[PDB]
Structure 1
Amino acid sequence: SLDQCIVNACKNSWDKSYLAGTPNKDNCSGFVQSVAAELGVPMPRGNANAMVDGLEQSWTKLASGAEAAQKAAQGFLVIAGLKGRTYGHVAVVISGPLYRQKYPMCWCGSIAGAVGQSQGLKSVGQVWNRTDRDRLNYYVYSLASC
């Protein structure tokens, strides 16, 4: 598989803790940072909101979840993100079947609980709610990871 490198990055980063004492599975930004670390992809610093500002400035914005899954299927690193008033959220888009023919499959940790967490079996549409999943932004890095 072409997107396999990224799947592995996600799997491994699952049990790590990018910030000490905070398990990645409980911290979205941490899990993303770990994935970017393993893949050697430059990643902006700080919490979720900050990371979204970073990607907004320095990364390519894709048009849709579907296009995002295209990039992600090509072995690119694709981050879906949206800011909150305080706690934002970010997730790693992976290749696969779109949910409701719209929302792509993701990996993310979440402080909201096990419910917000995705080991690849949920898409951004099952993580963000009905209103937020339509407001998502998708960022891709200019260079493939495979």
Structure 2
Amino acid sequence: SLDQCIVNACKNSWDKSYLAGTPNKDNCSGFVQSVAAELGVPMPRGNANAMVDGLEQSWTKLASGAEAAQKAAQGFLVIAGLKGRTYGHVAVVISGPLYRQKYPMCWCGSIAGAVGQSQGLKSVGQVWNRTDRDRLNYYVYSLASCSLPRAS
């Protein structure tokens, strides 16, 4: 349950517009920027390719989709990302069962529409094409953004 703050940030960010006039549900990078902003996590600016460039330079990379879900379950912000020839994609990994015992659940927006959108119910292995889903990078932030359970 330690990823609840991240899930809450995803829910809140879904209907926000990080770039004015562009719903985050239709903008993968904007969606992640709004989630990170609520959590107080500094992020690289720009589109998905630019965000992945920045994370590659500064964040720890996890070994697997399984490890990504595990870190999310400990309250860490974990971003799945992959650069593209014309457009990349980024998503927030959350705790939950692994699709095909490999691919974690995620939240993400996308200009592509429904295929690239997930409100926690699609895995990264269904959002990304079969030829991409084993090529994903999983970046984890250096501290856990989520908090202690309620004291009372």
TM-score normalised to structure 1 length: 0.99
CA distance in structure 2 between the partners assigned to 1:29 and 1:58 by the alignment: 17
- Post-superposition offset of 1:116: 1.2
Q: Any idea what the Cα deviations from partners look like across 1:28-78, whole Å, max 9, x if unmatched?
A: 000000000000101110000000000000100000000011101100000
The alignment covers a number of residue pairs equal to: 146
CA distance in structure 2 between the partners assigned to 1:67 and 1:131 by the alignment: 21
Q: Structure 1: give runs of 5+ residues left out of the alignment.
A: none
CA distance in structure 2 between the partners assigned to 1:139 and 1:86 by the alignment: 21
CA distance in structure 2 between the partners assigned to 1:124 and 1:111 by the alignment: 16
CA distance in structure 2 between the partners assigned to 1:120 and 1:80 by the alignment: 13
Let me know the Cα RMSD of the aligned residues.
0.5
Q: Any idea what the Cα deviations from partners look like across 1:88-132, whole Å, max 9, x if unmatched?
A: 000000000000000000000011111210000001001001110
CA distance in structure 1 between the partners assigned to 2:145 and 2:74 by the alignment: 9
CA distance in structure 2 between the partners assigned to 1:130 and 1:26 by the alignment: 22
Q: What SS does structure 1 have at the residue aligned with 2:35?
A: helix
Name the stretch that deviates more: 100-109 or 112-121: 112-121
2:150 equivalent in structure 1: none
CA distance in structure 2 between the partners assigned to 1:65 and 1:42 by the alignment: 23
Q: What SS does structure 1 have at the residue aligned with 2:119?
A: strand
CA distance in structure 1 between the partners assigned to 2:73 and 2:42 by the alignment: 20
- Post-superposition offset of 1:25: 0.2
Larger Rg: 2
- Post-superposition offset of 1:86: 1.6
Q: What SS does structure 1 have at the residue aligned with 2:133?
A: helix
2:32 equivalent in structure 1: 32
CA distance in structure 2 between the partners assigned to 1:67 and 1:114 by the alignment: 26
CA distance in structure 2 between the partners assigned to 1:106 and 1:2 by the alignment: 15
CA distance in structure 1 between the partners assigned to 2:101 and 2:48 by the alignment: 27
TM-score normalised to structure 2 length: 0.95
Percent identity, aligned pairs only?
100
1:41 has 2:76 as partner: no
CA distance in structure 2 between the partners assigned to 1:130 and 1:2 by the alignment: 30
